[PDB]
Amino acid sequence: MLEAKFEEASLFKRIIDGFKDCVQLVNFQCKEDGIIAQAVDDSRVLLVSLEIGVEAFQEYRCDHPVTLGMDLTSLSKILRRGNNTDTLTLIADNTPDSIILLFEDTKKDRIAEYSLKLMDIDADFLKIEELQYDSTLSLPSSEFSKIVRDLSQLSDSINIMITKETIKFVADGDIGSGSVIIKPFVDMEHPETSIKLEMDQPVDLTFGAKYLLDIIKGSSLSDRVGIRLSSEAPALFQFDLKSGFLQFFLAPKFND
Prior knowledge:
Structural class: alpha+beta
Subcellular location: Nucleus
Subunit structure: Homotrimer. Interacts with RAD30. Interacts with MCM10. Interacts with UBP10.
Number of helices: 4
Number of strands: 18
Function: This protein is an auxiliary protein of DNA polymerase delta and is involved in the control of eukaryotic DNA replication by increasing the polymerase's processibility during elongation of the leading strand. Involved in DNA repair.
Largest sheet: 9 strands, antiparallel
Distance between the termini: 47 Å
Radius of gyration: 19 Å
CATH architecture: Box
Main location: nucleus
CATH topology: Proliferating Cell Nuclear Antigen
Shape: elongated
Strand order of the largest sheet: 6-2-3-4-18-17-16-10-14
GO molecular function: DNA binding; DNA polymerase processivity factor activity; identical protein binding
């Protein structure tokens, strides 16, 4: 068997709301020591990679590595319920027909069991995180979100530029221009709101607004987002889970 018991179905919900809109299928790969899943954009521009470690469950037992390939549309129909507080248990059996999702009452008098028919997806995980990034930058996830949302009103393209202590996001559309400029600093009143920056070489990449919007769906998984930028590789945006992470590797445009 396999028994992933999340304390809060909520968490698993939110994690799927990352992938939810970006992509369309997903191979979960449950190992003896947690789950990994990886979805890729249609146009192959965005990669969503997820790890949940054993610590994130209240119980977790996985005897043999199963791959569960799911339809995201389907899975979010089963999710996203009024019961975001029931103990969701993912349940599956060796050589898996379908994955079972099991939601239980506090008082154990409402047990909504679901059986999601599975999808044979050929497993081809990509390892694309780099050793060294040109610049790495972290800031509250919501700030990133208002930024992305606020600049994406202009064009379909958003330009991040990093220089000595200046993070600068720029958009240019037919309406007119827009630039949001953040500076690194530290704050006591909330530590989880300051802005760290490491600039190993300045950066100037352009990303598509569409995708950046998708990528900020994850601001609800973590108070903070880690952004690693490179000219030689796809940018990595990371939100940290209590025992794992949601990663978006976004590929810059060339000249669109």
